[PDB]
């Protein structure tokens, strides 16, 4: 009900992988010019472009892309290089990838877009860039979690404000009928609850088991949120 990740977010190692992770642009060039395999995959399915993007080496990223590295390559769990750049708040890497036609709402095997990933990590900067590149702020991951549901679960206040400002649905429900305020209330995230209430969220909506956010917060023993919702309603 509260989960959107199946496992975690998440030999075969070649010299291109190592130089790309270390951001050594000249060596990557040399390895490429001598025939090295630009799309070699590790045991987990990582390409050199994954390694450069996960580590934030934007000029290695740019060089790899310019040389035809496949930006659609995904790991065993479905992470593309865009997902890994978002994981590390690597804005310029995200810029280069989107500039080379990377799909903004590419999904992993848990159905997460890069925006889901930035929300999960609380990366305000890449969140804003993805939203400006028409990332869908209501994209549905595993169990119907939108990026706003994720930011509310993880207590990402700046991210949630960004998503709300860009049209994330305050009333969207997961597959158990949890609204964002249900999620934030169950998790004891008092300031998130107040931001949703301030942005029009109904404290009275019920989940499929018939519980309000107040009922969920009390079930979870969240003293601060229980007091707040009692003050706001009673």
Residue numbers in the entry: 883 to 892, 1265 to 1488
Task: Give sentences from the paper.
First, we mapped the minimal regions of AI-b and the corresponding repeats from MBD responsible for the interaction. Using the scheme described in Figure 2E as the assay, we mapped AI-b to a 32-aa fragment (aa 865–896) from the linker. Using a similar approach combined with truncations of various repeats, we mapped the AI-b binding regions to R6-14 of MBD. We determined the crystal structure of AnkB repeats 8–14 fused to the C-terminus of AnkB_AI-b (aa 857–896) at 2.35 Å resolution. The AI-b peptide binds to the inner groove formed by repeats 10–13, covering a large portion of the target binding ‘site-3’ (repeats 11–14) and a small portion of ‘site-2’ (repeats 7–10) that were defined in our previous study. The structure is also consistent with our biochemical data that the autoinhibitory interaction mediated by AI-b partially inhibits the binding of Nav1.2 and NF186 to MBD, as both targets use the ‘site-3’ of MBD as one of the binding sites. The electron densities of the MBD_R8-14 bound AI-b only allowed us to trace residues spanning Gly883-Glu892. Although residues Glu865-Asp882 could not be traced in the crystal structure, this segment also directly participates in binding to MBD_R8-14, as deletion of residues from 865 to 873 significantly weakened AI-b’s binding to AnkB_MBD. The structure of the MBD_R8-14/AI-b complex reveals their binding details: Tyr886 forms a hydrogen bond with His374 and hydrophobic interactions with Phe399 and Ile404; Met884 inserts into a hydrophobic pocket formed by Lys407, Val437, Phe440 and Met441; and Arg888 forms a number of hydrogen bonds with the sidechain of Tyr365 and backbone of Leu363 as well as charge-charge interaction with Asp364. ITC results showed that single point substitution of Tyr886 from AI-b with Ala significantly decreased its binding to MBD, and Met884Ala, Tyr886Ala double mutations totally abolished the AI-b’s autoinhibition.
Ankyrins are a widely expressed scaffold protein family, which mainly function to link great varieties of functionally related but structurally diverse integral membrane proteins to the spectrin-based cytoskeletons. Each ankyrin contains an N-terminal membrane binding domain (MBD), which is composed of 24 ANK repeats and responsible for binding to diverse membrane targets. Following the MBD is an unstructured linker region of ~130 amino acid residues, followed sequentially by a ZU5-ZU5-UPA supramodule responsible for spectrin binding (SBD), a death domain (DD), and an intrinsically disordered C-terminal tail (CT) with varying lengths. We identified three distinct autoinhibitory segments from the intrinsically disordered linker and CT regions of AnkB, and elucidated the inhibition mechanism of these segments by detailed biochemical and structural investigations.
